[PDB]
């Protein structure tokens, strides 16, 4: 599923991401936009052999198990395929865990390089929230 911008904002808010750890909803919509282009099925191989999965490109080296990432931890205790569902609940639960692990949203490279310090409020403009 490729989410619309406001559709994803409403889902992220419903799953409790707005201001989770102080990150406004726009931060999460922006991060999902540049990580996956709002595509829940997005997957990307990393050079270290891990893979990034779903709307928030959660990495298999640390957060999920994909059975092909040597040295991986599975701190969200979930199959990486479960991060590709059209229902983003699992991605949100794992993102809540990730953003609380110490480096906040800097865990998302696209957020750090493209959203951090920007007018992230632009990402929720017009959404019924
Ligand atoms: C969205 C996503 O998957 N992003 C990936 C990043 O999570 C990942 O960076 C590494 O993340 C782990 C977990 O947050 C970092 O480990 C934590 O480090 C902090 C101190 O910095 C400490 O409080 C924690 O104990 C420790 N947690 C664990 C479980 O060990 C780790 O430092 C990050 N590594 C780097 C190089 O930034 C990167 C790299 O795998 O990939 C992103 O896609
Ligand atoms: Na794994």
Domains, the chain, with CATH or none: 1-129 (1.10.530.10)
DSSP for the chain, written as a single string = -B--HHHHHHHHHHTT-TTBTTB-HHHHHHHHHHHHTTBTT-EEE-TTS-EEETTTTEETTTT-B-S--TT---TT-SBGGGGSSSSTHHHHHHHHHHHTSSSGGGGSHHHHHHTTTS-GGGGGTT---
Which ligand is closest in space to the CA of residue 63?
A: 1
End-to-end Cα, the chain, rounded Å? 22
Is 52 an annotated catalytic residue?
yes
Which of 31, 59, 62 to mutate for ligand 1's pocket (most ligand atoms within 8 Å of CB)?
Answer: 62
State the closest ligand 1 atom to the C-alpha of 75, by its place in the atom list counted from 1. 29
CB atoms within 10 A of CB 77: 11
Which of 58, 88, 99, 101 to mutate for ligand 1's pocket (most ligand atoms within 8 Å of CB)?
Answer: 101
Q: Residue 69 corresponds to which tokens in the numbers above? A: 């990432």
The reply to whether 101 sits in an annotated binding site is yes
Judge if the beta carbon of residue 75 lies within 6 A of ligand 1: yes
Rounded Cα gap, residues 1 and 24, in angstroms: 24
Which ligand is closest in space to the CA of residue 106?
A: 1
Judge if the beta carbon of residue 61 lies within 6 A of ligand 1: yes
Breaks after residues in the chain, judged by C–N over 2.5 Å: none
Report CA 23 to chain centroid distance, whole Å.
13
Q: Residue 114 corresponds to which tokens in the numbers above? A: 């493209």
**Residues contacting 82, CB < 8 A, separation 6+:** 64, 90
| Residue burial 89-102, b: 16+ Cβ < 10 Å; e: rest | ebbbebbeebbeee
Is 119 an annotated catalytic residue?
no
Rounded Cα gap, residues 20 and 18, in angstroms: 5
Give burial (CB, 10 Å; 0-12/13-18/19+) of 115.
Answer: buried
Experimental technique: electron diffraction
Task: Tell me which residue of 105, 125, 100 sits closest to 117, measured CA to CA.
Answer: 105
Rounded Cα gap, residues 36 and 72, in angstroms: 22
């Amino acid at each position: 599923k490729v989410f619309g911008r406001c559709e994803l904002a409403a889902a992220m808010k419903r799953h409790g991401l707005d201001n989770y750890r102080g990150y406004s909803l726009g931060n999460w919509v922006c991060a999902a936009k540049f990580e996956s282009n709002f595509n829940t099925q997005a997957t990307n191989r990393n050079t270290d052999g891990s893979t990034d999965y779903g709307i928030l490109q959660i990495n298999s080296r640390w957060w999920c198990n994909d059975g092909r990432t040597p040295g991986s931890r599975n701190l969200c205790n979930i199959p990486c395929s479960a991060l590709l569902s059209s229902d983003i609940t699992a991605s949100v639960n794992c993102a809540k865990k990730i953003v609380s692990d110490g480096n906040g949203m800097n865990a998302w490279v696209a957020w750090r390089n493209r959203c951090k310090g920007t007018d992230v409020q632009a990402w929720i403009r017009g959404c019924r929230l």
